[PDB]
Amino acid sequence: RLPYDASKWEFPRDRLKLGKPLQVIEADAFGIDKTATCRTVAVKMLKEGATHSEHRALMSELKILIHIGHHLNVVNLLGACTKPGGPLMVITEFCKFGNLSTYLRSKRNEFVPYKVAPEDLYKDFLTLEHLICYSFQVAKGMEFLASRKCIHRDLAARNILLSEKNVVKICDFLPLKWMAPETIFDRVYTIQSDVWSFGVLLWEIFSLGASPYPGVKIDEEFCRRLKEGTRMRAPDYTTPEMYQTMLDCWHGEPSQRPTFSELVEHLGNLLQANAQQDRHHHHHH
Numbered sequence: 001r002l003p004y005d006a007s008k009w010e011f012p013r014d015r016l017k018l019g020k021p022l023q024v025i026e027a028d029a030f031g032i033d034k035t036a037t038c039r040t041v042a043v044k045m046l047k048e049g050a051t052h053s054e055h056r057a058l059m060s061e062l063k064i065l066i067h068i069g070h071h072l073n074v075v076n077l078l079g080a081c082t083k084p085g086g087p088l089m090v091i092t093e094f095c096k097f098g099n100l101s102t103y104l105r106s107k108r109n110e111f112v113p114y115k116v117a118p119e120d121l122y123k124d125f126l127t128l129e130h131l132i133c134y135s136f137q138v139a140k141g142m143e144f145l146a147s148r149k150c151i152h153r154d155l156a157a158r159n160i161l162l163s164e165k166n167v168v169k170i171c172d173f174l175p176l177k178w179m180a181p182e183t184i185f186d187r188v189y190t191i192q193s194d195v196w197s198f199g200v201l202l203w204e205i206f207s208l209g210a211s212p213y214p215g216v217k218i219d220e221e222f223c224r225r226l227k228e229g230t231r232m233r234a235p236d237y238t239t240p241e242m243y244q245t246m247l248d249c250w251h252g253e254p255s256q257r258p259t260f261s262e263l264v265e266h267l268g269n270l271l272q273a274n275a276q277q278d279r280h281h282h283h284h285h
């Protein structure tokens, strides 16, 4: 229902060289930017002979990306192949490091709460700044999306991609473990149910890529306890304020949950407090 401005977005198919799968494939785009002649990109592609409505599905995903516009923290669209002569393709930037869950998982043995001299001892280590930063960035991207009447409806670490210089992007590739009570029992999807999922995302970030609800069977007994107010315990890498933010996001009443604007504000403050603290840590030792 939204428009497709081909003049701005259309990109020729034989200007792409498809590489390895990631269906979504990595590829070289030739002449997609003003800045570079060759650029690495990610391409979302319809499989041969797929359904009419599967076409429209991918078409809308493209149109939504156009309509919302650019944000640093939502996977940046670069172009599309929509015209006849080949498969429908949607082209974004390539985030070098992949999904956040896996990346945090690889960093388990490379974590320190904060750095001091000699800093080269913790080269490429994750710190609390990184973890709070990733959360701040996703929140800003979600505030952006909520601002435009978007509802992600599957917000999770697996759907967060990591690029250079610790920049994270929101994208979309068992799901129940991220769903709000009302989404499970009423089949309702709102901005506020996205806030629930963000809380679960927070837990993933401050557990360094752990699977939510560890050990627990995901059956109808799981659902009952979620509706009744049972919550995950604090993850191993959390700060007290962070865990309370997770508890805030997991409020039983959707309207009692913080908004994304409030989360942006709060985590920004938590990021500054942590930074100040680290300055003292660094300066005293």
Ligand SMILES: Cc1ccc(C(=O)NCCC2CCCC2)cc1C(=O)Nc1ccc(N)nc1
Pocket (backbone or CB within 6 Å): 022, 024, 042, 043, 044, 061, 064, 065, 074, 075, 090, 091, 092, 093, 094, 095, 096, 097, 098, 099, 145, 150, 152, 161, 170, 171, 172, 173
């Ligand atoms: C190529 C592509 C096209 C579209 C999307 C995508 O997220 N579509 C849904 C858009 C949602 C609508 C609201 C904001 C997110 C993701 C991709 C993608 O998978 N990008 C990607 C994948 C892996 C890596 N490493 N980098 C980029």
